[model samples]
Target: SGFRKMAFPSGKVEGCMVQVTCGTTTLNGLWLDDVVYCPRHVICTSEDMLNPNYEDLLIRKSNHNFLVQAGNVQLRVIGHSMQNCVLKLKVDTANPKTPKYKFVRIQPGQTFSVLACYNGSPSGVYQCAMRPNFTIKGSFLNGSCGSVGFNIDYDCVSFCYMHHMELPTGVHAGTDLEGNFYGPFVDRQTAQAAGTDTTITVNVLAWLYAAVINGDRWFLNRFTTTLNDFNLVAMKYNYEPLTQDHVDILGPLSAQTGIAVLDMCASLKELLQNGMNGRTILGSALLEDEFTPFDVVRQCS
Candidate 1:
């Protein structure tokens, strides 16, 4: 059926006076009588009238205990023993104006079961307390039944989580070297423009440049030059690299340091001669970029 909108402008339109009655016995019966004042002939039909008394209609309703009394003012409970029973009222008698009825009652074990009132509005947040939650393994070695805390090791290999579960800060610890703390940190691929340079160094430098500005690397583990003694397992979000360059660029170390960049890339000698220039790189290449790692964050201080 097609839908129709009903609008009655206030002030010019007078509010109608209605009198609703709660029948003698309790039953789920709704009385829907519409008084549409369309300026035309008075069409009074039999189908328009609900059957007299409408007693049997109560049995079919969900709960055999509900009543709505009509009056100029509002709802009035008519049934005799409604002493402790709860009655929630709606602003308008019409379903569109009124919402569904919510019921909160004390249950066994001193617990309370709160049910939402409206068919239009599903009761609560509509979320399960323990709906199968998902988590990406913190690293390339995620979800190996390993714990998420620091498991101190000496002889055995150690699996280190990001410090504060954040990408480790620069070796200086006071500066944000890797990037922002929030991350999509598998070393995201930069979308190259139509005539952009296509080289690993260019691409890596482009991402590194972006990360520094957006603070996206606070979640990356700090990178180390020597891997034999200072092996920290920094996990790439969705990849497991089988080579050095992949690991180096995506690893926790700051490629901003000239020496570090040289150590990571074999063909990086050309650029490494000049130490990384922060403002030049940020302004020249990654201009007008507004991508933020976090959906929301503190304003950059």
Candidate 2:
């Protein structure tokens, strides 16, 4: 298998697990120090990466954490960010106090896996915290991080699937100058387009916003926050944002066209009317099993 053939200098690589202990490498144009190497499966940004060279592939993207759906497979966490700020991360179910494998230094551009991906286990329910570099330390594995200023629970999903477009560079998602929070919109600095087949990833966030507009419980449960955690949820699943031109091209995007907006963006009454109507337009693909949202989200009025 391609994964097994990857050459490690010290004969430390195994399958998709790197065994270099306490060692460090600069990580090529290709690279992390202490990274010692997380023994990751480099993903090829082509085809539906559902079946990668290895089942447990590496995922390194910031803010796009919501992509790790409740039912999907959890993969390895590597590196990246939105505000270009360095953050801390850990597995929610893992031992909390152990700082080594707990709060890792997730730097910008490059990524570093501090521990052995928690014994190379498929970790889900991973938590990400804010405020770069310095850590206040709280209970990440215990499901309560309120002790800190801000935190979040995001999925570490397996290989990049069809719905998402991998951000080879990274993401810088957040509130725009107009005080409106958003997903990856700007070029280069935020996220570089690494989509294969020239299939530019559509602004699926537009769809996610509507789901929240109708107050879809299934969708809201996962993305709940004053800032509308939707920022991370949208890109985490590989969806990008629509630029002003794209939105203009999209027009009012009301029920007739099947899209409105989301999370506190408009009046509740008017939103429901438009939201419910747009919900119907999504139809079978959303309600049935053909499309992804199936059980993960969507509930009728």
TM-score on alpha carbons, each prediction:
0.14, 0.22
Tens digits of per-residue lDDT, candidate 2, 50-115, equal: 434332222333323311111123323343212221122222222212121122222111111111
Give the poorly placed runs of model 2, Cα more than 4 Å off.
1-15, 23-116, 125-265, 268-301
User: CA lDDT, every prediction?
Assistant: 0.22, 0.23
* TM-score, cand. 1 vs. native: 0.14
Every model: Cα RMSD to truth: 26.2, 20.0
Best by lDDT: 2
Consecutive 10-residue window with the lowest summed lDDT within model 1: 126-135
Over 1-301, each residue of candidate 1 has an lDDT whose tens digit, in order, gives 1111111112111111122222332211111222111100001122322232222333333222333433223433322211111112222334222212221211111111111112111122110010011111122111111011111122221111111111232110000111121122211123311221112222343344344534443212334344321112112111111245434543333333232432333222322334334533333332221211110111121
Q: How does candidate 2 fare on TM-score? A: 0.22
What lDDT score is found at residue 105 in candidate 1?
19
